[PDB]
Amino acid sequence: AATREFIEMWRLLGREVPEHITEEELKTLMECVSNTAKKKYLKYLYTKEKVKKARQIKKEMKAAAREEAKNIKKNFLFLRLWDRNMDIAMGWKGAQAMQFGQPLVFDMAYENYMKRKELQNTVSQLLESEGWNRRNVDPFHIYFCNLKIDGALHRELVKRYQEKWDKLLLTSTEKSHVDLFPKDSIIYLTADSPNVMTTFRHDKVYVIGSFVDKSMQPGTSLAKAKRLNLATECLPLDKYLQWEIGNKNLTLDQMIRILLCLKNNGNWQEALQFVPKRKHTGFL
Amino acid sequence: SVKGLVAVITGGASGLGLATAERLVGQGASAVLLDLPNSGGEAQAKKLGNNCVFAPADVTSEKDVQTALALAKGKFGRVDVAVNCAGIAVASKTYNLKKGQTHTLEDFQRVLDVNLMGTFNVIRLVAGEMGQNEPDQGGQRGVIINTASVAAFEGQVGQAAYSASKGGIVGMTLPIARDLAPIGIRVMTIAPGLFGTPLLTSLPEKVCNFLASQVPFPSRLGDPAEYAHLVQAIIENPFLNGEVIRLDGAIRMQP
Amino acid sequence: SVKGLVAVITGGASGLGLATAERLVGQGASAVLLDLPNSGGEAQAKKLGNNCVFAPADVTSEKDVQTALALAKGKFGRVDVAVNCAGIAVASKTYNLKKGQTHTLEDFQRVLDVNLMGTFNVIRLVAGEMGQNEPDQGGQRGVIINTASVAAFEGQVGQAAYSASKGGIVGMTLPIARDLAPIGIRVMTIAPGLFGTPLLTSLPEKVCNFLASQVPFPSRLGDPAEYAHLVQAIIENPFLNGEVIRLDGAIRMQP
Amino acid sequence: SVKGLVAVITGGASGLGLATAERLVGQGASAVLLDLPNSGGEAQAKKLGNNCVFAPADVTSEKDVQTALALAKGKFGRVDVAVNCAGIAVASKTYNLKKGQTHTLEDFQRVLDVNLMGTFNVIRLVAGEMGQNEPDQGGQRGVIINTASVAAFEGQVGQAAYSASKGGIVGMTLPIARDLAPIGIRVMTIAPGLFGTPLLTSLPEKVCNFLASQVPFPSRLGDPAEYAHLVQAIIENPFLNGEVIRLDGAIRMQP
Amino acid sequence: SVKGLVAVITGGASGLGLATAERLVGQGASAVLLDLPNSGGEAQAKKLGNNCVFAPADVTSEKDVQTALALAKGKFGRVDVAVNCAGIAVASKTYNLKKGQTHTLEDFQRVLDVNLMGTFNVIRLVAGEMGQNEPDQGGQRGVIINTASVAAFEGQVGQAAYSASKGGIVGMTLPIARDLAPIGIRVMTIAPGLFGTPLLTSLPEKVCNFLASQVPFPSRLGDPAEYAHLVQAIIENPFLNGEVIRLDGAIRMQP
Ligand SMILES: Nc1ncnc2c1ncn2[C@@H]1O[C@H](CSCC[C@H](N)C(=O)O)[C@@H](O)[C@H]1O
């Protein structure tokens, strides 16, 4: 590719540019069809190396630090096998959740509204969100609805989980949540809903739209809910928090941690602990 | 040996019961498939040849099992082995405080009816048929093999109805063996673990995969032909009586 | 301690249930005697004072138990302990070749209906009432104690129906304990041996004194008061859950 | 009641043994802490007052136990209750293919020496001491309580030696109860699950929370005081003989 | 099938071990009689043809078993099956008040060493030899069969030492099955009761002829060939793992 015609002086020009690039990275560079977009991507691609080597340099510096102390310097009940035992324990709990647990739906029908940066970030929040469900005392039955098998979102999920994808204790499906559940019990959670969520209802299916629009697109989740006949609710952030800073649309890992706290009889004081403290000045 | 014996297999149209009939017939025995009319056991009976027939009967009905046993006695002249494999299950918690659902009484009743009394309904009726048999050299008239589950020992969440019925089979195994000891009838119970049967297949595929991997060794679902092998071993061993044999691959079910 | 606790004892008009109520009420608790209308529980409830009330109900019917628990809620405001002492027995061989007599299916179903179905029916409805209670400092909402004699393990000749019912209670003790673990309800099972219940004192002195001498130590029939003592011990111990406790004086029933 | 009784508690300087001594002395009984000289038994016996004394002895040595039993007779005049809480734990895989490591035989022998052999050494010697007692109104001469573990039923990976020693205690509890029944001595066994002994509390907080979460209910490690409560209940209840009681909060250990 | 398998039979010079070797060699397998030098195993090995060899070794000695296992490696190349049948017994009671006799400590130690420690000594050493085998189509490297006794559950009077060692084998059969699960080795336990062994001929004939009538059915002493048949059944069934199989003819041992 001739796209090297930009990089090979942009390094000499004085802008921050990474030294190691591949054709796969080079391909995504040419979709950036403006000077600022290319500069923004190159800045991201440059800082990837910057924290890599800095953390790289840290780790073998530690290797010398421990190898000198490790080489120079009884009755037990259990073998030290806890990480294996914890994973098995969460597996049994997840298997029980898939049968009797309350369903929670992550709507994957937002692939067409996301750029590559946003789509990748959605998976990262999805990975953390499902991780917190596993470690909970009373896990949800997590559903991935509207997830196209060949779609971009599915391929990214497979790449991140690798072998674990086929072994996850969650129900991923092509069908919409309206096909799996009665339309009366579905409550599409969205920040733009005019109805404020008062109490957590254990006989309802809460739908979270897996949409991370860093280029914020208000009303997208509400439009989907009103395109169907689904009811909507919004978190009582204004009721219990003194907001000052930032968007009121929380991340997927914060949302699931708020719902999990509510499901475990926690009040709104404990549940809203997971709203970033940088966005408000205390609970009232 | 097993050749020449007549075996009445309840729920023999599918699952563990069908695998037992395939092995026993293949070994030279004669089998009668006792299952519901809509279970499709007629096709299976024709597939196994002239040595296997299908008796449409419901184990929970006294008259139905009597018709089946008369059919077995008419076709083959005698009954030598009874294998109780017919069973159902439900997935329902005793009480779900969050959702406010209580386990219904009909679900508990129907599981108890099919799994527990229907097993006892067969045992008392066929023991009369075995009671007509002349003793062999060891003084034995027949062998009754029941099917409990590991749920009778470590039941899972939502398995209360299933565990109560299978637990009952374990409880009455020894008393029935003592009851029929005068007349030379052995009563044995098998407690299979996770097996490739439609009862466990109804679970989600990802739940089945996790459960299969949790079996210490072999790390797979129990193949039904391995259940049939254990049944043949119990039939051929004269000293096995009044005992519950766990066939689960050393798995212990967590809640 | 048990002072202030409200206990619903099924079959509390006689036998083990009555002994449990006398101890619990004598220790400062309140007891709701749940038994048959003709069992004479009203006379027993009057003798035990104002802290004990009689609720006539048949455990086999969901309607009667619901009204009985509504009476327990009305009189004392809450339910803390459920003691399932209600039970019947039948002595009949599975099959008698010398007599051509077969165990009656109605007899087998009748024993299961009261011993097994009635116990679960009480458990599933009582768990709804303990679910309304606020967890205490230890997070406990209630205790359920079931009765299932040693016949569940080593039943005697002609005890197939009784062992099947008691084997069911033992088998389902753990799955129910896992079911109610999120709620905070402990489910425990007691396996009494030969006790001086009005049933055992009815049979002639020949079998009465012989069986009392068959207990290794103490060589006597179990005092129902000793059953009540172990019932109270389970209530007071927070860490007893999902376990079957044999209270028999180490006797193993021979055929 | 337990007031006036004399209790010999092996391994009574810490853990379950110390908790049993604290409750029995508090309830009005006298205790003898039978533990190793290097343990803090002398400080513990002083803390419990003049009703508790420390007898240094190794349960694996016949001579050491006899001197301890002589001390109990000298100080208090008689022996009423023996509690066998002394024991060690060793975690070691039977064979590790990747590491080429085989379980060491000396590891197996030492666990069997203290847990299994040590328990029986106390039992055979303390039984003779209770054989000198005049029977009470019930004809009883003493109570012997052994401490098995849940590993005797579901041992985890690496607990081959520990489970074998604890499984043997479950094995001997009924035959010994039969041996001592003519004498009038009851033998019982308690199988604690995960308890807050110094062995478990020394573990990192990360794994301590996990072990607490594995218990169905209550979701916490067993309080040693709860073990003491069940020990008292066995002593007071005359009809508990030859039975293993699991005190584990319905936990079933995973591999 | 068992054809071509190499089995190391512990204590195979008489009783259950000799019967197991007799059946396996007849079916086409190879056997190694691991017994004491004075047991007369060389005559048994010669009588069984070139497929059977004698390895004189004490199960309590690590050196003796390693040489015996190396002999099997030299003669046959691999070890596929291990059957632990060697065991001794003692009839001393725990304590005799009338005679002032206490169970001597060495009798308990000697029985424990041969039965419990000896079984584990063979298990851990044969696990290394089985770990060298290539996993078969089912991923299995070998099968280890242990011989407990019915005394592990309902041991009689004067069987405290025997029940302890046999209870230990039952206790550790699951952790070892869990320990060896990643390798691909199945551990199963047989619990025979009253078999026609030399052990059941040392006792007085009138007592022995009385026990033969105590078995409900078959009302006789167990044929060692029946034990050999069950061992072959366990070998050929891939899903039998971690379970104790009672082979007693439904007998429950009275005090
Ligand atoms: N304050 C809030 N109350 C309820 N749900 C919220 C919320 N903030 C975010 N969410 C949920 O978290 C998900 C990602 S926030 C993105 C929402 C979407 N881009 C929009 O503009 O409407 C959404 O599906 C939404 O349902």
Residue numbers in the entry:
A (entry chain F): 92 to 164, 175 to 385
B (entry chain A), C (entry chain B), D (entry chain C), E (entry chain D): 7 to 261
Give me lines lifted from the publication on this model.
Here, we present several cryo-EM structures of the mitochondrial RNase Z complex (ELAC2/SDR5C1/TRMT10C) bound to different maturation states of mitochondrial tRNAHis, showing the molecular basis for tRNA-substrate selection and catalysis. The human long form of RNase Z, ELAC2, has two alternative start codons to produce a nuclear and a mitochondrially targeted form. TRMT10C is a purine N1-methyltransferase that acts at position 9 of mt-tRNAs using S-adenosylmethionine (SAM) as a co-substrate. SDR5C1 is a moonlighting homotetrameric short-chain dehydrogenase/reductase.
To trap an mt-RNase Z substrate-relevant complex, we mutated H548, which coordinates one of the two active site Zn2+ ions and determined a 2.9 Å resolution cryo-EM structure from a mitochondrial RNase Z (H548A) complex preparation in which the mt-tRNA precursor was predominantly uncleaved (RNase ZH548A-HS). However, ELAC2 pivots on the mt-tRNA by approximately 3.5° compared with its position in the product complex. Due to this pivoting, the RNase ZH548A-HS structure shows a difference in the interactions around the discriminator nucleotide and the scissile bond compared with the product complex. This may be attributed to the absence of the first Zn2+ ion due to the H548A mutation. Notably, K700 switches from interacting with C72 in the product complex RNase Z-HS to interacting with the scissile bond, i.e., the C73-G1 phosphodiester bond in the RNase ZH548A-HS structure. The scissile bond is followed by the mt-tRNASer(AGY) acceptor stem. Only the first nucleotide (G1) was modeled; nevertheless, the cryo-EM map contains additional density for the mt-tRNASer(AGY) and reveals that the acceptor stem contacts ELAC2 residues G156-P157, which are situated on a ridge in the 3′-direction of the substrate RNA. Taken together, in comparison with the RNase Z-HS product structure, the RNase ZH548A-HS structure reveals additional ELAC2 residues involved in binding to the mt-tRNA precursor and in orienting the scissile bond, namely E130, K700, and G156-P157.
